[PDB]
Design an enzyme around this catalytic site. Structure first.
Site, short mmCIF file in Angstrom:
data_model
loop_
_atom_site.label_atom_id
_atom_site.label_comp_id
_atom_site.label_asym_id
_atom_site.label_seq_id
_atom_site.Cartn_x
_atom_site.Cartn_y
_atom_site.Cartn_z
CD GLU A 46 -2.46 1.22 2.85
OE1 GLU A 46 -2.95 0.11 3.19
OE2 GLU A 46 -2.67 2.28 3.48
NE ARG A 67 1.63 2.74 8.56
CZ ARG A 67 1.05 2.78 9.75
NH1 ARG A 67 1.72 2.41 10.83
NH2 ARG A 67 -0.22 3.16 9.86
CB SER A 106 -9.98 4.35 7.06
OG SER A 106 -10.54 4.02 5.80
CB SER A 127 0.15 5.47 6.82
OG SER A 127 -0.45 4.23 7.15
#
Ligand SMILES: Nc1ncnc2c1ncn2[C@@H]1O[C@H](COP(=O)(O)OP(=O)(O)NP(=O)(O)O)[C@@H](O)[C@H]1O
Ligand SMILES: Nc1ncnc2c1ncn2[C@@H]1O[C@H](COP(=O)(O)OP(=O)(O)NP(=O)(O)O)[C@@H](O)[C@H]1O
Ligand SMILES: CC(C)c1ccc(CC(=O)N2CCN(c3cnc(Cl)cn3)CC2)cc1
Ligand SMILES: CC(C)c1ccc(CC(=O)N2CCN(c3cnc(Cl)cn3)CC2)cc1
Ligand SMILES: [Cl-]
Ligand SMILES: [Cl-]
Ligand SMILES: [Mg+2]
Ligand SMILES: [Mg+2]
Lengths: 352, 352
Positions: A121, A190, A175, A178
C-alpha cells in the site's frame, strides 16, 4: 487487456485507467469487442452505476506510459460496492494495492480471465506520488501550499516545486493515518500512524449530527462554530497562558465544553460537525509536526481523501504547522490527493 | 491561618490542607474560633456540601512540614462550584495555581482577609510530584507500574523507585494534556500538549451515551466492546499487516465502523463509551511515546484525574507503551495522581 491500477482501501476503491489514444487502424480492427465496450463505457460516462465517479478534472492528457501515448483517468467508488464491481466484471492483469488487495483476493479470482498481483500500500503510494509530480499536472504543478497561511487576507494557494523531493514526510489521511519518511526513491519507512483519521471524522460526525455523506458533513462543518463545543485556553485561564506561549484561542480541551448539560443542550449539529473536523485535523497536524521534528524533515505533504473537497482542513493544517513550528515546517498538498496508490499499482505492470 | 494549597483547573479544584497535630496547650487556647471551626469542619467530614470530597485514603499522616508535624489532606470539588466555596469563605495566605488562579483572581479577593499568590501550573506540578515521592505514601511507594503489562494472567501493580527521578517525562491528563520533560529539579520544559484529554472523553461520552458523571462513563465503558465502533486492521486487510508490523487487532480507524448506518443502529452506548475511552487513551499513549523518543527519555509518568478510579485506561497505557516501544518505555503511575499541583502550591508558602 486494459491497463488498470487499483487501490482498495478501507473506505474507497481508487482506480487509475490508462486510455490509449494512439490506437492504429490495425489495432482498432484487432480489438476484441469486450475491450472496446470497456473503453467506450469508461470514457463516455462520468458516473458509473449509482456510486462510481470519474474525477474528470484530474485526467492527465497525452501522457506517454509504457511507450504508448494516452490519457490517465482517475475513478473512485465505495469499497462497500466492490461486490457489484466484481459481479459486473464476471459478465486482464490487475495490479492491486491497499488492504483490500489481500482481503478480497479470493473474490477477484472469481473472474476467470484475471491475474491478481498484490503490491504494498505504501510502496505504491511513494512510486505514484513521485511519478505524478514528475510528469506534472498537464504542465501545472502537482504540488501546492498555502502562502502566508497565518494571515487570512493573504492566504492563497501557490504552486510548490518538488524537483528534489527528498527528504519528505508523507501523511496519508485515509480511514486512518499512515506517516512515511521518504529519504530517496528506494529508501522510505512508515514512521508511525494514528487511528484518528478520516473515518473518525466521518464516523463521529454521523453519530453526533446524523449526516449521511462526507460532503454533507463538510457542509455542516462550514456553518458551525467549534468553540461552542471546545474549551479554549481562555476558558481556563481567562486569557493567554503566556508562560508557555499558549494563545487564548488555542483549544485546551476538544469537546471539553460538552461536559456541561446546558451547553450540550444549546450546541448545534453544525457546531459539532465543525468541532469534529477541527479536533481530527489539528490532532493530525500535531502528530505530523512531531514526526517531522523527530525525523528532521521540514517538508510535510498531506494526501488521502480526507482532504478532497476539504479546503477547511487544508487551511487548518497549513496554518497550524506554520504557527506551531514558528515557520520551520511547511504543509504541502497534491492535486491527485487520493490516487497515488492506484497509480503506483499501475506502474508495477511491467514486472508482470 | 490554615495552610492550604489550591489548584483550580478547568474541571476540578484540588485542595491540599495541612492539619497540625502538634498543637500545644497554649496554641489551642490562642486559637481563633473560626480557625478552630475550619479544622473541625474539614477533619470531621468527608463530603463537603453536595460536591466536595475528601480523598481519605490519600492522607499523609504524621508528615513534618515547615517544622510542624501534621497530616496532609487531599480534597476536590468541581470548578463549577467554586462560587459556592468563595461565598462560604466570605462568611489567610492562599497559594493558588492552575488557570483558575488567574481567571478567578478577582473573586478570591472578595474575601477581605485573603492574600492570593499565583504560582505556575506546571512548576507546582513538578515540585509537588517530587515532594510526595520523596516523603513516600506513608512508607509505601508513591510510584507504581504494571509488571508484564503484555500478559494479562501476569499483569499486576508493582511499586517503582524514583529516587533518582531524572530525566522524566510527565504526562498531565486533565481537561487537556500537558507533556513535560523534567531534567532536574530546576530544569524542565513543557514539550507540547494535546487537546484530546479527559474533557474530550467526558464531553464526547456525554454526547454519545447520555452519561451524567465521569464514574458512570467509566462504568458504561467497562461493559462495552470498542471493536463494535472501531475499524481494525483486520477489517481492512483481512488479517495482520505484516509488512509494517501491524497486528490484526490494532485499531486502524477509531469510530471507523460508524460510517455505516446499519452499524450505528446496532452499536450500544456501552460500546461507544468504551470506544471513546480507548480512542482518547491510545492517542495520549501514542503522543507520549513520540515525545519520549524525541526527548530520549524512557520513564513516562502519567498524572491528572483522567486516570483516577480508571484502571482500564492505566492498563491500556501500560500495555500500549510497552508493546509499541518493544519494551523500551515504561508507563509509570502515581497514587496522588490529581493533586501534585495543589501540593506544589502549598510548598510555595514560605516564599510569602
Ligand atoms: N465520497 C466519500 N465517501 C467516503 N469517504 C470520503 C468520501 N470523500 C472523501 N472521504 C473521506 O476520505 C476518507 C477515505 O480516504 P482514502 O484515502 O480513500 O482512505 P482509504 O484508502 O479508503 N482507507 P485506508 O485503508 O486507511 O488507506 C474517508 O474517511 C472520508 O473522511
Ligand atoms: N468527579 C469528576 N468530575 C469530573 N471529571 C472527573 C472526575 N473524576 C475524574 N475526572 C476526569 O478528570 C479530568 C480532569 O482532571 P484534572 O487533572 O483535575 O483536570 P483539570 O486540572 O481540572 N483541567 P486542566 O485546566 O487542563 O489542568 C476530567 O476531564 C475527567 O476526565
Ligand atoms: C494502513 C492503515 C490501514 C492504518 C492506519 C493507521 C493505523 C494505526 C497505526 O498505525 N498504529 C500504530 C501506532 N499506534 C500506537 C503507537 N504507540 C502507542 Cl503508545 C499506541 N499506539 C497506534 C496504531 C493502522 C493501519
Ligand atoms: C495547560 C492546559 C490547560 C492545556 C492543555 C493542552 C493544551 C493544548 C496544547 O498544548 N496545544 C499545543 C500544541 N498544539 C499543536 C501543535 N502543533 C500543531 Cl501542528 C497543532 N497543534 C495543540 C494545542 C493547551 C492548554
Ligand atoms: Cl501476487
Ligand atoms: Cl501574586
Ligand atoms: Mg488508503
Ligand atoms: Mg489541571
Amino acid at each position: 487487456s486494459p491497463w488498470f491500477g487499483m487501490d482498495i482501501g478501507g473506505t474507497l476503491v481508487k482506480l487509475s485507467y490508462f486510455e490509449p489514444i494512439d490506437i492504429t487502424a490495425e489495432e482498432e480492427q484487432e480489438e476484441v469487442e469486450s475491450l472496446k465496450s470497456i473503453r467506450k463505457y469508461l470514457t463516455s460516462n462520468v458516473a458509473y452505476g449509482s456510486t462510481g465517479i470519474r474525477d474528470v478534472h484530474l485526467e492527465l492528457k497525452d501522457l506517454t506510459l509504457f511507450g504508448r501515448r494516452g490519457n490517465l483517468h482517475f475513478i473512485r467508488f465505495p469499497t462497500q460496492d466492490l461486490p457489484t464491481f466484481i459481479q459486473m466484471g464476471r459478465d486482464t492483469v490487475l495490479c492491486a494495492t491497499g488492504g483490500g488487495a489481500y482481503k478480497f483476493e479470493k473474490d477477484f479470482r472469481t473472474i476467470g480471465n484475471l491475474h491478481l498481483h498484490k503490491l504494498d500500500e505504501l510502496d505504491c503510494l511513494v512510486k505514484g506520488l513521485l511519478y505524478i509530480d514528475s510528469v506534472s499536472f498537464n504542465g501545472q504543478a502537482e504540488c501546492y501550499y498555502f502562502a502566508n497561511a497565518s494571515e487570512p487576507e493573504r492566504c492563497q494557494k501557490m504552486p510548490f516545486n518538488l524537483d528534489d523531493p527528498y527528504p519528505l514526510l508523507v501523511v496519508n489521511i485515509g480511514s486512518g493515518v499512515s506517516i512515511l519518511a521518504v529519504h530517496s526513491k528506494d529508501n522510505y519507512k512508515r514512521v508511525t500512524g494514528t487511528s484518528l483519521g478520516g473515518g473518525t471524522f466521518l464516523g463521529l460526525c454521523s453519530l453526533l449530527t446524523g449526516c449521511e455523506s462526507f460532503e454533507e458533513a463538510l457542509e455542516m462543518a462550514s456553518k458551525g462554530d467549534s468553540t461552542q463545543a471546545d474549551k479554549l485556553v481562555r476558558d481556563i485561564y481567562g486569557g493567554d497562558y503566556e508562560r508557555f506561549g499558549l494563545p487564548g484561542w488555542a483549544v485546551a480541551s476538544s469537546f471539553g465544553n460538552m461536559i456541561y448539560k446546558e451547553k450540550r443542550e444549546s450546541v448545534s449539529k453544525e457546531d459539532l460537525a465543525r468541532a469534529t473536523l477541527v479536533t481530527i485535523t489539528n490532532n493530525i497536524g500535531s502528530v505530523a509536526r512531531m514526526c517531522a521534528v523527530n525525523e528532521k524533515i521540514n517538508r510535510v505533504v498531506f494526501v488521502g481523501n480526507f482532504l478532497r473537497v476539504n479546503t477547511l482542513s487544508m487551511k487548518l493544517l497549513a496554518y497550524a504547522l506554520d504557527y506551531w513550528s514558528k515557520g520551520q515546517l511547511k504543509a504541502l498538498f497534491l492535486e491527485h490527493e487520493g490516487y497515488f496508490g492506484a497509480v503506483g499499482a499501475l506502474l508495477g505492470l511491467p514486472n508482470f
